[PDB]
Design a protein around this nucleic acid. Structure first.
Ligand SMILES: [Mg+2]
Length: 228
DNA sequence: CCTGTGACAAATTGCCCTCAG
DNA sequence: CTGAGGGCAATTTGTCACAGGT
DNA sequence: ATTTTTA
């Protein structure tokens, strides 16, 4: 049995997406990525791109009060305006219409229809993971890294991944100061590895690769907790 | 050029409180 | 009661000066 | 439900 179907996980929603989206350049908050997980699930459960979110189900899934769930949704929704996702040279807006609330506790969004082929009809070159794996992660760049690791994950839960550092900076859109490699180490790399090791079922180590005086790549290795 | 760390600026966390319906 | 508002201190993330080649 | 990518 593959760990995607392990008994403790199987009941959580299966999030699935093309590797082009896993590799795309975009910048979303934790809260925005949490809602996008719910949109992809909904879309795949049956599409014109019009989706829904209930405050009450959001609070239940992420372990929040009703009031904070309402705050998270309202502010993340407004901040979606003007956000674009760039595939690799090809930019699309996430939303083609502002969000609105038809009735108390309910919100309605229109996801760009040109993005729907990135979430359905996948036969290969896709990324998969259970929502329960990511819902305790806090830092949004730790969410980006976890999805990239998942992209090379074998059915048994393990894998290895080399990632060029210039590429990480471009596609995750890290802030300016993380071009200085000691800041990249202390505020992105160590922080995100610690989050994955303590909030997911993945167990992760890494080694730096150098060319001359420059560090150019990180090489990641990992195994699943249910195999240990 | 490269490294780590102290410090300070700005953003984000989970909580708290009020009230309409 | 929920959930749509208003707020908080604690805590993390983003930036840079400095010391020094470990 | 599933698979093709790093190097
Ligand atoms: Mg919040």
């Amino acid at each position: 049995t593959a760990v995607i179907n392990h008994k403790k996980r199987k009941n959580s929603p299966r999030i699935v997406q093309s590797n082009d989206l896993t590799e795309a350049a975009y910048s979303l908050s934790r809260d925005q990525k949490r809602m996008l997980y719910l949109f992809v699930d909904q879309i795949r459960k049956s599409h014109d791109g019009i989706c829904e979110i209930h405050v009450a189900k959001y609070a239940e899934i992420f372990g929040l009060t009703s009031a904070e769930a309402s705050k998270d949704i309202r502010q993340a929704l407004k901040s979606f305006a003007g956000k674009e996702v760039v595939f690799y040279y090809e930019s699309f807006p996430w939303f083609i219409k502002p969000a609105h609330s038809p009735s108390r506790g309910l919100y309605s969004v229109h996801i760009n229809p040109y993005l729907i082929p990135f979430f359905i009809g996948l036969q290969n070159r896709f990324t998969q993971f259970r929502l329960s794996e990511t819902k305790e992660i806090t830092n949004p760049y730790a969410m980006r890294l976890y999805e990239s690791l998942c992209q090379y994950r074998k059915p048994d839960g393990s894998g290895i991944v080399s990632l060029k550092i210039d590429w990480i900076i471009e596609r995750y859109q890290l802030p300016q100061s993380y071009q200085r490699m000691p800041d990249f180490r202390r505020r992105f790399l160590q922080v995100c590895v610690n989050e994955i090791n303590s909030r997911t079922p993945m167990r992760l180590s890494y080694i730096e690769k150098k060319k001359g005086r420059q560090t150019t790549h990180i090489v990641f290795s990992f195994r699943d907790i249910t195999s240990m």
